[PDB]
Amino acid sequence: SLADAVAHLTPERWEEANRLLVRKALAEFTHERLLTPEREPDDGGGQTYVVRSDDGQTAYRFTATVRALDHWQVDAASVTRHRDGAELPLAALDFFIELKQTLGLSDEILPVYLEEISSTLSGTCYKLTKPQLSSAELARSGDFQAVETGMTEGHPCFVANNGRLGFGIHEYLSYAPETASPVRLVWLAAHRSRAAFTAGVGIEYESFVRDELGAATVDRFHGVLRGRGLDPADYLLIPVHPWQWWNKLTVTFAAEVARGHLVCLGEGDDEYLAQQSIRTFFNASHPGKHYVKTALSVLNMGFMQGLSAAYMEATPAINDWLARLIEGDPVLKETGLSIIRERAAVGYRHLEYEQATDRYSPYRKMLAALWRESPVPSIREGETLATMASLVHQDHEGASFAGALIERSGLTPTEWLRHYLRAYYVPLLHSFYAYDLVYMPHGENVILVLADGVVRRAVYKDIAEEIAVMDPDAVLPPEVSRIAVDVPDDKKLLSIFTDVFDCFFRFLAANLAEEGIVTEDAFWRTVAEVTREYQESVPELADKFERYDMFAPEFALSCLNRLQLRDNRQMVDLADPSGALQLVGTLKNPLAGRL
Amino acid sequence: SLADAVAHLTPERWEEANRLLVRKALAEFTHERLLTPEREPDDGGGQTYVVRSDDGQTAYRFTATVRALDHWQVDAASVTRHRDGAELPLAALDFFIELKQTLGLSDEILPVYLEEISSTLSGTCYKLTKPQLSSAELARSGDFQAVETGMTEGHPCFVANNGRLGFGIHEYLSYAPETASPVRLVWLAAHRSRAAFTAGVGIEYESFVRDELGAATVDRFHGVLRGRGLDPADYLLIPVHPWQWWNKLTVTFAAEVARGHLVCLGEGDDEYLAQQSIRTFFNASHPGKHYVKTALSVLNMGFMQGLSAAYMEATPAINDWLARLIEGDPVLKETGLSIIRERAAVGYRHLEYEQATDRYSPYRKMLAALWRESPVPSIREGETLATMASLVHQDHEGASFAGALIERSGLTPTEWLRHYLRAYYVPLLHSFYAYDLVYMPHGENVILVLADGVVRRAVYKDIAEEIAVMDPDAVLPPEVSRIAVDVPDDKKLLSIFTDVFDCFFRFLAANLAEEGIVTEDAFWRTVAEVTREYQESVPELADKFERYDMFAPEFALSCLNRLQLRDNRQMVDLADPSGALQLVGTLKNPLAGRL
Numbered sequence A, B: 001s002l003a004d005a006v007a008h009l010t011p012e013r014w015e016e017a018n019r020l021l022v023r024k025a026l027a028e029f030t031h032e033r034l035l036t037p038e039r040e041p042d043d044g045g046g047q048t049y050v051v052r053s054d055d056g057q058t059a060y061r062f063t064a065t066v067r068a069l070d071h072w073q074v075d076a077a078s079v080t081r082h083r084d085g086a087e088l089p090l091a092a093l094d095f096f097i098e099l100k101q102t103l104g105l106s107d108e109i110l111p112v113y114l115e116e117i118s119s120t121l122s123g124t125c126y127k128l129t130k131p132q133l134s135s136a137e138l139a140r141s142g143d144f145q146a147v148e149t150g151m152t153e154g155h156p157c158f159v160a161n162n163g164r165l166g167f168g169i170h171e172y173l174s175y176a177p178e179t180a181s182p183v184r185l186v187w188l189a190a191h192r193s194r195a196a197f198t199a200g201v202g203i204e205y206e207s208f209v210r211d212e213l214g215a216a217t218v219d220r221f222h223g224v225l226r227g228r229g230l231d232p233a234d235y236l237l238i239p240v241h242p243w244q245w246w247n248k249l250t251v252t253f254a255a256e257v258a259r260g261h262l263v264c265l266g267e268g269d270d271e272y273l274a275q276q277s278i279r280t281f282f283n284a285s286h287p288g289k290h291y292v293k294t295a296l297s298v299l300n301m302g303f304m305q306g307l308s309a310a311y312m313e314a315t316p317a318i319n320d321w322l323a324r325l326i327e328g329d330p331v332l333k334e335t336g337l338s339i340i341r342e343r344a345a346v347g348y349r350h351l352e353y354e355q356a357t358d359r360y361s362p363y364r365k366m367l368a369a370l371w372r373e374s375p376v377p378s379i380r381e382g383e384t385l386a387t388m389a390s391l392v393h394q395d396h397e398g399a400s401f402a403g404a405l406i407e408r409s410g411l412t413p414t415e416w417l418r419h420y421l422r423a424y425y426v427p428l429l430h431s432f433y434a435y436d437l438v439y440m441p442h443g444e445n446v447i448l449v450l451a452d453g454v455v456r457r458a459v460y461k462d463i464a465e466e467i468a469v470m471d472p473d474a475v476l477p478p479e480v481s482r483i484a485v486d487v488p489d490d491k492k493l494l495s496i497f498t499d500v501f502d503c504f505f506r507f508l509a510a511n512l513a514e515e516g517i518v519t520e521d522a523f524w525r526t527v528a529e530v531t532r533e534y535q536e537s538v539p540e541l542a543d544k545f546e547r548y549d550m551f552a553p554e555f556a557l558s559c560l561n562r563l564q565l566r567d568n569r570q571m572v573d574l575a576d577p578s579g580a581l582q583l584v585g586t587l588k589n590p591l592a593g594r595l
Ligand SMILES: Nc1ncnc2c1ncn2[C@@H]1O[C@H](COP(=O)(O)OP(=O)(O)OP(=O)(O)O)[C@@H](O)[C@H]1O
Pocket: A153, A154, A155, A156, A161, A162, A276, A277, A278, A279, A280, A293, A300, A301, A305, A389, A440, A442, A443, A444, A445, A461, A462, A465
């Protein structure tokens, strides 16, 4: 109705959303040491802190509990703001304008950054309008996509995390995952002179699209091409995000459309759900068919969600080499690890934009797609699926979704932890130590298999784009050897300490202690024991276990927000070794002393 | 359908659209001396030229007539392109890649430029699907808006002229002036803490909006506010481009919507047509009511079509000063000059984006509006209205619309030229010399009143954004004094030589010569006579006519494409003096030797 598109934008909901983001900015900027909150002694008997603006006129006061890994658990309800003796409302845009110098926001970035904050607050507002499911309801539900679309936090480190800049509000309401709006994919026929299909082992092109689309939808598509005088044999099918088609391909790639390099074939019939990754689609009409990952030229969390055409050629081969490696490794067999492969990929090489740009240009990232197998067919009765991100979910009441899997399970907290850590964490140690293999194993990149509230096994996704072998001489099959990187010995283990300890377990341990379920002490003792249990079981690697010490007293603080604030479009650039990293002192390893 | 949004994008139209844009590229790049065509020996008549790529491997051949002001009338049909012995098809993207260095197209700029070339070509394709009216049929029509929306060329110097980047293809189809789609404006209530209305003489706010919307639409609007707990007294009506609402104001300005600084009221009832200026709307329901000029954060022709809040305070006062000045001057009274005033304006100051940006940022331009009186009430039976751009319109067969006004008038071409030049060109001479006052008097900024094919009088528009008094000490009413600028004496007369002669008459004289209607000699003879006739009628300015000599042998070549090629987003900066200018040698004044 026009008014309906903005109904979620009200003073009360805006207000809650601003208290929520300022709470997280005080928390996470303090963690990253942009803010050093000073204590005031009286009220909470050691619990009240102030942070001042660049000019020192405006003060932010809060109650916080400081947990392992220099984690500030800032109380939302406690946040207040003062200038020259009086109180002001909590306003995120103002907070950023007031601590511009202090956070190293440049004149250049600050405005776009405020636009990403607005958009993050807009989403918070939309989600505060959805039925407010407790973590109990959501865990009891056992609906994979009720959990996928129920998540509210997004990336727990990045403050400006849920931006989706590029979507008008109409497009936010149609495309953001938290809406759970069905999407039909748009299907193009891409001429073989500029498009290329890559198949994983056991994939054949004709049967693959037959399986995905149905014989009848393939023939109809072959009929659009014949009616236009074109030979179906000269084209490959490429599905696209409807936003990419209507806003980019019809304008940016108009030449391709006009010349018949791209023919529009229409919507496919199946209904998709955008996942936490906004450009990845799960097939709601047929949960067993492939996810489709699409090119989407929006700004989110320091990157265009474009998809590289050039990465596609090697992508199924990387997945096949990894699946085979997991199959053949006793330790990985025993954790129950599995991936959902990227089975198939199609790239489109825009020849002219290629002649006009470098290999790093988002103008070469505007038309690819890949298919990735669904985890649904692999589950048995009593099993349900949930993104690992669910484990750091709190509901509207502060109630941990992990806490609710624990209550549902009947296990002690720590028994429950040991099943999860054996399934998710031990594969990561083994992969590091046995093969120098690291993934990007954050909430979004792992799916848990649950049975009566217990983590039975973990499924890694996002394989070709994310995995590395940290050894430049790694002998690999020619097709997968791009994964071989050069990372200095003193940084290798950060793959575990940063991406698991500091960017995930910090939140999990905090949530469980805050809600009174189990001490950080017990939490970290459990991680320690699983670590020792794994190491004891592979004595062949003892020299490497000492070289890369999981029980080192400290490790480097790697600041995630600092990357985004120095560059709101290219967070990490063409550093093909690494070292766009912002390392600022060290944290105390909660494992220090438990070897 | 989906297929229907791109129906205009076919190989035959694409192929035509590229021939037309490469012809224009060769012509105007040559005019601006980026290219230096070399003669091929007189095999097929003489007048055959070659242009080579940066790498000398690609050759562009054409025939061309060279006309006054170094105008290259390149024959579209003659453009051929060759490489290593063999002919290639005409592709504008390739032409730009091949001459990237030659045209000073930087790595940063080239991909965006190509994206604007693509969008311009799509334009041409859409336009070629329309009913192909002869310059006769149009001239005969008498329909103001059939001529407005019937123009195909756009600005005649700029090659990348009809970009509209920001518009998805559905939005192109909705909002582009050449489509003549009815648009309903979206109305916002803006809180008086951040919004200011400004009135000309005779304008009162309440009566104004009552005349524009009708009392019923105001009552309904008032009731939307009351239904939400809000006092209508606390708010001011701002109409916005629906693109700006859905894609910017709901997202970029979300905090203002949420906090109730902006309330959505609905669509207005009346159907508007976008004018050649994409963000300017003519009321088609009520041709008599005000045009509305909108904030539109789209890239077109080297500028966001944003609209400054900051300049609305002075807009109506600048219009009223000028209108009164014209009324007071015997010479401008005899020419019949009038303006359609900017009567009302409303600005919105986003307080936070303002604290985060400088006076120049496009984030201070996303919400403003002004109302400009319609020319329709002022005309008398026999009189029709037509953009001055119509005079340089050719139809699909090369037929000039100026030529058709001439045929239809019964006058000799020169008698016809004299009426036009008295109405349009004399007020610009007298404004320069008497008042140091200049406009931006191109096709878009002038409307002709026509009687029996004759130009009776001209109406200037685009007053507050464009005019200057080139005397820094000029005594002016407090509220219009910003109009006063410092311009070097040796550049003042370029306002005439460049904006009138080199960027408009050059085209008119060439088109009329090309079609066999009248010689360049006679064309410029006529400009000279009218110049002398004006000059002789104001002897008290004789010293100033000697100083700023209209009959000087040369004046500087000012290049318009070279501006957009250096900086594709801010081609003139709002900072530094008339210094963005790219003067490259001089042109022979066709008035030279006719004092
Ligand atoms: N809890 C979360 N943790 C991490 N990322 C999240 C989370 N919720 C949402 N996201 C989004 O998911 C993306 C994570 O980055 P990543 O590179 O893994 O994504 P991708 O490559 O688009 O995904 P995919 O796994 O489908 O290949 C970001 O765009 C981020 O905003």
